[PDB]
Design a protein around this ligand. Structure first.
Ligand SMILES: [Ca+2]
Length: 221
């Protein structure tokens, strides 16, 4: 709306959570489907939602059930690519046309998130996500545990990195979950997103909450 538009327009960087915000799905749950272990993994993903558990361990546990091969990830991207949330294409377009720097931050995986960023004309340099490792033959080999997104609080750590690198004056974090809400601070403002699933505790506690990306499209262009 009005005050929301003024806040939105003041941003010089916008960071989007990926799973359930930029896309309708959860990258890791979709990889779990492609790999045949969806039920177990999707419960663990629920267990981990919010600031609920040590992220690095929950990620290891889930990846150990999945054991994604390079070709499986490759197949996910080619045959079962995630669905962009309605309106995100247009929103990112309006942001970029205003020279707002857009980032994607995800506890999911660079291979999938870079695919999503490409669809949004977000450079890979603006993607922060976990990196799967693979052995020479493609077998799952683990993940890069040095990534900020591999730890609890990783979204806030990414935003701190961006502030230190680029000195943005006003970074807004946009996402569906408590972990996104918990990235402000260091983000300057947080907008909760409930277009795919409403996380009531975010909706109840966020100063700004939208259920439809059009709501930020506060003009006619
Ligand atoms: Ca999310």
């Amino acid at each position: 709306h009005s005050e929301l538009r003024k806040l939105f327009y003041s941003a010089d960087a916008v960071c989007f959570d990926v799973d359930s915000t930029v896309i309708r799905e959860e990258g890791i749950d979709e990889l779990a489907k492609i790999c045949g272990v969806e039920d177990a993994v999707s419960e663990m993903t629920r267990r981990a939602m919010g600031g609920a558990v040590p992220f690095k361990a929950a990620l290891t546990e889930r990846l150990a059930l999945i054991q994604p091969s390079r070709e499986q990830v490759q197949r996910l991207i080619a045959e079962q690519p995630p669905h962009l949330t309605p309106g995100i294409r247009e929103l990112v377009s309006r942001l970029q046309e205003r020279n707002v720097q857009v980032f994607l931050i995800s506890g999911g995986f660079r291979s999938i998130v870079e695919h999503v960023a490409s669809k949004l004309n977000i450079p890979a340099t603006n993607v922060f996500a976990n990196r799967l490792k693979f052995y020479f033959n493609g077998e799952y080999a683990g993940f890069d545990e040095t990534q900020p997104t591999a730890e609890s609080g990783g979204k806030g750590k990414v935003i701190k990195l961006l502030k230190e690198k680029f000195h943005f004056k006003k970074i807004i974090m946009i996402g569906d979950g408590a972990t996104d809400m918990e990235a402000c601070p260091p983000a300057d403002a947080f907008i909760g997103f409930g277009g795919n699933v409403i996380r009531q505790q975010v909706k109840d506690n966020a100063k700004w909450y939208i259920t439809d990306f059009v709501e930020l499209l506060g003009e006619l262009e």
